[PDB]
Amino acid sequence: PQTLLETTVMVSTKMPPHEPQVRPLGVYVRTGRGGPNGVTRVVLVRLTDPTDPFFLFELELLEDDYNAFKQHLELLVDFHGFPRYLVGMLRDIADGASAYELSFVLNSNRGTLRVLETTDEKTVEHISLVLLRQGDAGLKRYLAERFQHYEQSFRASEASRAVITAELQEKIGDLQAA
Amino acid sequence: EPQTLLETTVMVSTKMPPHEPQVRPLGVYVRTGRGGPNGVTRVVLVRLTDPTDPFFLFELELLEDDYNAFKQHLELLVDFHGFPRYLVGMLRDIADGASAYELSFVLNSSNRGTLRVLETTDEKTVEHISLVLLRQGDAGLKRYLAERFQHYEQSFRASEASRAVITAELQEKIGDLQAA
């Protein structure tokens, strides 16, 4: 299970409680294994909001439903190659040097994420993904994991800070005696 | 002012039906603030958590308006104002290790549990306080998990920020003392 992309990206969002607006969102793309028996290859696309921890949308693209998916979007790429394609596009948008935009529009418990090139005449669509809002179960899991992760990271930070403070304090303490 | 009187981990004798009777570390958290049906009644929150299980969350929201009944039932001789001071002092003593009192948390069987501070003499197990904590629902749990997540992320950032500062501040002090 490898994580191909974790970053924050600026996104044109239509959400009914709010107004149409351009917000930063977290996009996460992890390839792994899953499905009804944990045997089918999978690509996860997860959309999150750094300002709202209860905002969580995911698409679990099962390899067995990829043919239909490939055809509907008229892609010319393996299941193997698809995330590479998607991530490259997102990364370009994230890294700021790109002509493409991201749109996330609600429609509720489903939302569509689109990579769009905007020319003079037309808004050209390069990909469209339907992400499902996650239920309490999956959200709790997400929140838990994040919490555990950042706590763990916070500990590690302090641990290695104490190490370094001491390592250099001894190098200050030896330059002082000499 | 919503003030946090105690956040610490304390060793606790626990009866929980999925597990065996055992002495685990648990997180006790005592925050005084304001709340209730209209957000106007003074409140004391006691929260019990498990560092090993993020889905374990038990809380008592002691409303000042139901404290008289509470005070009588436990036969306390303390204000609502003084009560948490009392409770926290006891817990802190137990946490500090310099204490004759123990903590007991026992579940039912599964959404209520009782937390007791107990002094064990030769003849009797004397009870100094008993609190009933309610397991919290997905709503309150998600809120908890969210807050913790945000907090530790925020803290993790701050740690790194001030680490980079210090590494540089001392590396410059290593970089200057060697040449001089």
Numbering used by the authors:
A (entry chain A): 131 to 237, 244 to 314
B (entry chain B): 130 to 238, 244 to 314
Sentences from the paper on this structure:
The cartwheel is organized through the homo-oligomerization of the highly conserved centriolar protein SAS-6. High-resolution crystal structures of zebrafish and C. reinhardtii SAS-6 fragments together with biochemical and biophysical characterizations demonstrated that two dimerization interfaces in SAS-6 mediate this oligomerization: a coiled-coil domain that forms a rod-like parallel dimer; and a globular N-terminal domain that forms a curved head-to-head dimer. SAS-6 is a highly conserved protein that is found in all eukaryotes that have cilia/flagella during some of their life-cycle stages.
However, by introducing the F257E mutation to strongly weaken head-to-head dimerization we managed to crystallize construct Lm SAS-697–320 F257E that contained the N-terminal head domain and the first seven heptad-repeats of the coiled-coil domain. We subsequently solved its X-ray structure to a resolution of 2.9 Å. The crystal structure revealed that the L. major SAS-6 coiled-coil domain is a parallel dimer and packs via conserved interactions against the N-terminal head-domains as seen in other SAS-6 homologues. The F257E mutation abolishes head-to-head dimerization in solution, yet, in the crystal, due to the high protein and precipitant concentrations, some of the SAS-6 molecules present are found nevertheless in head-to-head dimers and form a curved octamer. These data suggest that the closed Y215 conformation corresponds to a low-affinity dimerization state of the head domains and might therefore constitute a potential regulatory mechanism of SAS-6 oligomerization. The presence of curved SAS-6 octamers in the crystal of the Lm SAS-697–320 F257E mutant that is strongly impaired in its ability to form head-to-head dimers suggests that wild-type versions of SAS-6 would adopt even larger assemblies.
